[PDB]
């Protein structure tokens, strides 16, 4: 075994309810943007120092990339509409704190940068200090990832209005099937977004995968934009 995954790794074909042409008016091809896109995510984890703060701790790094590719739009040379680049640096601990049938398994604290690699005016980025907590119980997995925005957020000063201050993740193992829900919700502004997924093994390393996203903040360029996206494709690893 050579490389470690962090988040999920998948490639799906999607259709959004509405494409945010406004935010991307700067690109010449934007006026002819289509609603169907290839969406894919790559997510790797890189252990840098095992045992830094004990036998079950790790200084580590991760990198998650989400891309939206206008594949069918040959008229405009099938450009990428958006890519989000999400590198992290963290301290992780493998734990076994049991409470009410639930076992806390992962405690992770670190720094997160999330940006889209564009110049103005379509530049988007923010920095967060976060903690990720993962607990399981039977066929259930629950992950809470609260954060604190730090630094400059001039590209989208009101990003927390739409993203809130935490991300909740729920997994359910139904046989080899994995039902998943990933979401954010700011109570004070009413804005949020949810990602429901379903995956099933085709083989020991490949899974069929269907995803539905609804709400705000699917990508940085659509952080303040509401859409519903449905997609089908393949997956390497699901959450558990």
């Amino acid at each position: 075994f050579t490389l470690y995954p962090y988040d999920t790794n998948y490639l799906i074909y999607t259709q959004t309810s509405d494409l945010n042409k406004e935010a991307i008016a700067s690109y010449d091809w934007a006026e002819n943007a289509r609603k169907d896109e290839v969406k894919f995510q790559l997510s790797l984890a890189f252990p840098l120092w095992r045992g830094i703060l004990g036998p079950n701790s790790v200084l580590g790094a991760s990198y998650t990339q989400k891309s939206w590719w206008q594949l069918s739009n040959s008229e405009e040379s099938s450009p990428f509409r958006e890519t989000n680049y999400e590198p992290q640096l963290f301290l992780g601990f493998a734990t076994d704190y049991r409470f009410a049938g639930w076992t806390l398994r992962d405690v992770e604290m670190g720094y997160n940068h999330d940006s889209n690699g564009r110049s103005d005016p379509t530049s988007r980025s923010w920095n967060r200090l976060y903690t990720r907590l993962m607990a399981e119980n039977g066929n259930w997995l629950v992950e809470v990832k609260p954060w604190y925005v730090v630094g400059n957020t001039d590209d989208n000063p009101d990003i927390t209005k739409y993203m809130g201050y935490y991300q909740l993740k729920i997994g359910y193992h139904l046989g080899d099937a994995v039902l998943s829900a990933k979401g954010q919700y700011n109570w004070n502004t009413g804005y949020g977004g949810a990602e429901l997924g379903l995956s099933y093994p085709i083989t020991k390393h490949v899974r069929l995968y269907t995803q539905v996203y609804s709400g705000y903040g699917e990508s940085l360029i659509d952080y303040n934009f509401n859409q519903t996206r449905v997609g089908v494709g393949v997956m390497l690893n699901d959450l558990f």
Partner: peptide, 13 residues
């Protein structure tokens, strides 16, 4: 060992 644990996996080799 452990299903879903990113950290436990990273500790492995």
């Amino acid at each position: 060992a452990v299903r879903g644990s990113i950290i436990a996996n990273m500790l492995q080799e």
